[PDB]
Structure 1
């Protein structure tokens, strides 16, 4: 027979999962600054262009992290 159930607390669980993705982002960041330093040591003359490309790396990875965070916040308030 039919039983429709609306469990309110579940929206917390999913929110937490949406935050786990942030790890794959944050680690992502370090990698870019893990290698940037090495590059600056290998070719110190390009300390500027490499910095800009890493910042672009941060932007693209960071953008993926806000897309996940939007799902995290939407389910926390709904």
Structure 2
């Protein structure tokens, strides 16, 4: 027999999964700043250019985080 079911609470589960992807983003930030400090110690003269590149790495990695976060919020309210 044909049965159509609509579970309202499932949208919560999908939202939580989308939040997990943030871990791959948050850890990625630490990696960039984990090696930025070493680079500064290695070549202190480039404390500026390295910092700008690290910020760029944060931007690209952060942008991926927001893309995942958008899915998280869309399913939370829909």
Say yes or no: TM over 0.5. yes
Aligned length: 78
Q: When the two structures are superposed, what TM-score results if normalisation uses the length of structure 1? A: 1.00
Runs of 4+ in 1 over 4 A off after TM superposition: none
Please, what TM-score do these two structures have when normalized by structure 2?
Answer: 1.00
Q: Deviations over 1:10-69 (max 9, x none)?
A: 000000000000000000000000000000000000000000000000000000000000
User: Which ranges of structure 1 fall in alignment gaps of 5 or more residues?
Assistant: none
What's the RMSD between the two structures over aligned residues? 0.1
Whole-angstrom distance in 2 between the partners of 1:48 and 1:2: 65
Q: Which runs of 5+ in 2 are unaligned?
A: none
